[PDB]
Amino acid sequence: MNIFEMLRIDEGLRLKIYKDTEGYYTIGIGHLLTKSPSLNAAKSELDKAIGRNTNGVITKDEAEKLFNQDVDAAVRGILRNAKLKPVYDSLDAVRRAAAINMVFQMGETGVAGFTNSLRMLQQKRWDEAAVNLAKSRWYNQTPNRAKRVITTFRTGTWDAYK
Numbered sequence: 001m002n003i004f005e006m007l008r009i010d011e012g013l014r015l016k017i018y019k020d021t022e023g024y025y026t027i028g029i030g031h032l033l034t035k036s037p038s039l040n041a042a043k044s045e046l047d048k049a050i051g052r053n054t055n056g057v058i059t060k061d062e063a064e065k066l067f068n069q070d071v072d073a074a075v076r077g078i079l080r081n082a083k084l085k086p087v088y089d090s091l092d093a094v095r096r097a098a099a100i101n102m103v104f105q106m107g108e109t110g111v112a113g114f115t116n117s118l119r120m121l122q123q124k125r126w127d128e129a130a131v132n133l134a135k136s137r138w139y140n141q142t143p144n145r146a147k148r149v150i151t152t153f154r155t156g157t158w159d160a161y162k
């Protein structure tokens with residue numbers, strides 16, 4: 001198990017434009033296109049991302065390319081943030097994957113609300129951090145996925161993805 005396999009499980013793979021859990025146009029392995037309700041706007045973002053006129057359908061290779069870019073971007077986003085970097089750096093490789101997962105799902109400023117959780121994670125107060133992470137819109141809206149990610153933070157194992 002690794003970050004790619006983990007996010008592949010949590011996000012799935014769809015080669016046609018679909019709406020994500022929040023109702024937003026998405027493609028591939030959870031590649032958010034736009035928050036606009038316009039399918040045409042979404043198709044435009046897709047074409048821009050792929051570099052060709054797609055009309056809402058991509059290949060597996062194209063999906064995986066976007067996925068690689070997105071995972072890369074998530075990690076880079078963490079390290080660029082002078083406040084988030086220390087927490088990330090304090091973690092083992094398994095928990096780092098859990099951090100990337102959350103960033104991927106909500107954006108580093110979607111994680112702005114997780115300040116208190118982050119503090120407990122840096123303190124390695126795993127059970128306390130786990131309890132705190134669940135007190136969130138995130139957990140309530142996507143409980144199955146949140147439970148998996150939280151278990152990964154609690155244990156530092158891949159048990160939730162077995």
Ligand SMILES: Fc1c(F)c(F)c(I)c(F)c1F
Nearest residue numbers: 078084087088099102103111
């Ligand atoms: F740097 C970090 C992040 F940006 C983050 F979102 C989470 I959840 C983390 F646990 C973390 F360490």
Ligand SMILES: [Cl-]
Nearest residue numbers: 010143144145
């Ligand atoms: Cl599930």
